[PDB]
Amino acid sequence: VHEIDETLEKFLAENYTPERVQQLADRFQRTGFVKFDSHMRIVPEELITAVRAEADRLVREHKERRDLVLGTTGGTPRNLSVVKSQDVEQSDLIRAVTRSEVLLTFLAGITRERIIPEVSDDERYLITHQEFASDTHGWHWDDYSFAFNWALRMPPIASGGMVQAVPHTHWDKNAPRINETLCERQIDTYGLVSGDLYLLRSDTTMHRTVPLTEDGAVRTMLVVSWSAERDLGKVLTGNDRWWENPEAGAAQPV
Ligand SMILES: N[C@@H](CCCC[NH3+])C(=O)O
Numbered sequence: 001v002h003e004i005d006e007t008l009e010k011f012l013a014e015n016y017t018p019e020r021v022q023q024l025a026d027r028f029q030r031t032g033f034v035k036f037d038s039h040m041r042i043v044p045e046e047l048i049t050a051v052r053a054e055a056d057r058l059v060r061e062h063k064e065r066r067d068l069v070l071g072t073t074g075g076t077p078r079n080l081s082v083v084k085s086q087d088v089e090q091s092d093l094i095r096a097v098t099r100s101e102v103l104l105t106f107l108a109g110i111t112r113e114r115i116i117p118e119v120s121d122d123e124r125y126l127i128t129h130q131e132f133a134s135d136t137h138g139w140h141w142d143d144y145s146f147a148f149n150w151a152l153r154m155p156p157i158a159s160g161g162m163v164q165a166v167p168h169t170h171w172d173k174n175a176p177r178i179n180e181t182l183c184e185r186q187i188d189t190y191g192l193v194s195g196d197l198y199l200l201r202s203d204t205t206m207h208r209t210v211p212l213t214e215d216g217a218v219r220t221m222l223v224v225s226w227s228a229e230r231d232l233g234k235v236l237t238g239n240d241r242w243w244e245n246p247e248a249g250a251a252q253p254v
Pocket residue numbers: 070073123126140141142143223224225243
């Protein structure tokens with residue numbers, strides 16, 4: 001019920017000072033990435049366990065396999081299973097924590113700008129489920145500024161699945177220049193463990209997941225998308241919504 005908004009207001013208050021937020025806002029501006037791991041929690045471990053169970057049920061009852069390349073992102077592959085945004089919104093818990101006014105106001109101190117939780121209907125939420133060798137979420141950008149991700153299940157680092165990122169880029173759907181960007185920039189790699197969360201500046205940080213090296217290395221990620229003020233009134237272009245529509249124009253199966 002309404003207990004989650006009071007639980008977050010107490011957990012954030014006893015775990016963060018205003019200047020620590022400013023330090024995280026500096027790292028966020030510099031790298032586009034702030035990891036909330038066991039050393040710096042953002043949500044209590046009780047809620048993570050509950051969210052993990054909600055995602056396991058949604059994956060078990062709604063996972064749809066994706067094996068395609070996206071033209072608007074230089075033909076990068078998408079090899080994983082998805083749970084559409086429409087099915088994730090069935091979870092009252094996920095909607096409660098992700099649309100919480102306490103969380104959006106706190107995280108606004110890290111982004112240093114207003115976080116509007118409203119995005120496109122088919123991209124509000126997303127669960128990616130990777131489990132096969134060479135499963136990957138290829139290099140891409142997001143249409144919206146922010147992504148709040150729940151690394152609910154992570155394999156060991158040696159199995160792959162780390163998040164790679166190139167901050168201070170931009171999405172040009174007509175000329176993605178994926179590999180050209182890598183030749184001009186350096187790649188940051190972030191290791192995640194089960195229960196980690198992270199905030200991503202997803203519209204200017206080219207990112208991907210390192211392909212899994214072996215079958216059974218289950219990787220389940222809850223992806224929450226939020227708008228910035230720059231995202232209001234956005235007109236979607238490219239016809240590349242592969243997660244909702246597998247037969248999108250810019251999507252070619254493999
Ligand atoms: N634009 C991303 C999908 C984002 C889905 C979650 N916000 C891609 O091409 O892979």
